[PDB]
Amino acid sequence: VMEEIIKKAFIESINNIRRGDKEEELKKIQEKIVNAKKIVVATNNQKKFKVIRDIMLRVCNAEIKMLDIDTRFADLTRMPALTKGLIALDIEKADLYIARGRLGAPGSGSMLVILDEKGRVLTASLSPSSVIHKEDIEERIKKELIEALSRIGISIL
Amino acid sequence: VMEEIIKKAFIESINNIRRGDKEEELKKIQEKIVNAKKIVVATNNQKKFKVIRDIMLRVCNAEIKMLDIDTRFADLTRMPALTKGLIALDIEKADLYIARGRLGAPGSGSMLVILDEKGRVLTASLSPSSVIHKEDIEERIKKELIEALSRIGIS
Ligand SMILES: Cc1c(O)nc(CC(=O)O)c(C)c1O
Ligand SMILES: Cc1c(O)nc(CC(=O)O)c(C)c1O
């Protein structure tokens, strides 16, 4: 049915009557996150994985697994985090894919992104460059994931 | 040149000794935005153009121009904002491109992005779905641009 809602949105864009996001779109996204039972985290360090896993378990009742392959094979692309997400989508079966990496060019800070079964971007969050930041990574990852969930109306509480 | 710094970064990644962003990279980004001489705003829109312009004229001493053509056609792609940025990049020349649109799928909130001459993503910022923050486009675009500049050390 997501295909249907997005189709409605696209029809609205075609007819030049679209004004931003619709409530049914957002609730479809939230329902998609909350009702997810399989989640893949596309990084090899387990710290990251634990943070993300335990956060996501309070939002959904999913099996959350990690990725055996390492994704440095994305640190040469234009948007590394997204590329990691797409690699994970290509080699692993899930209803949600969670990725974290560099936003764009070297120096651009960090991005965490959540993709669905067909590679659509559901939500994302950013952190300043670790260069200026100088704060811990687990707390920063927690901040990223919580903002990414909250900005689409999902409470970790 | 940015080509060299990025090449070194890529080399570190190849030899698997890369640890993250380095200060000469960030300094190259700041260097890139502050010393811009031309900035293109990827919109036909009044509100947006003036909003972005007012910040950017106070951060740099560039000619800041708008787009004769409008980029609503990007609202059917996977990441509309980036696509808008690439359209602007594709049809007119500048040292900076500022684009603003939907992050991803319908319902996913908004993204503002800043691109260099070669379409590289220098910085970006995100907003919750307009469904949730019921603020309209000019308050949060300013918040987005200011956040995007601040996150890379630009005041
Ligand atoms: C067309 C369009 C859309 O469908 N969604 C958004 C994000 C939002 O409404 O929060 C934007 C900015 C937009 O330009
Ligand atoms: C390889 C790599 C990089 O060059 N930059 C960043 C962003 C940062 O340093 O905050 C990340 C996360 C990263 O994995």
Side-chain angles (χ1 to χ4, degrees), chain A residues 36-54:
Chain A
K37 293 176 296 298
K38 296 183 58 181
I39 302 176
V40 164
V41 185
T43 294
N44 68 348
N45 199 330
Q46 185 127 39
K47 317 175 307 206
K48 315 228 179 88
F49 178 65
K50 211 221 169 38
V51 174
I52 293 167
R53 194 187 60 186
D54 278 349

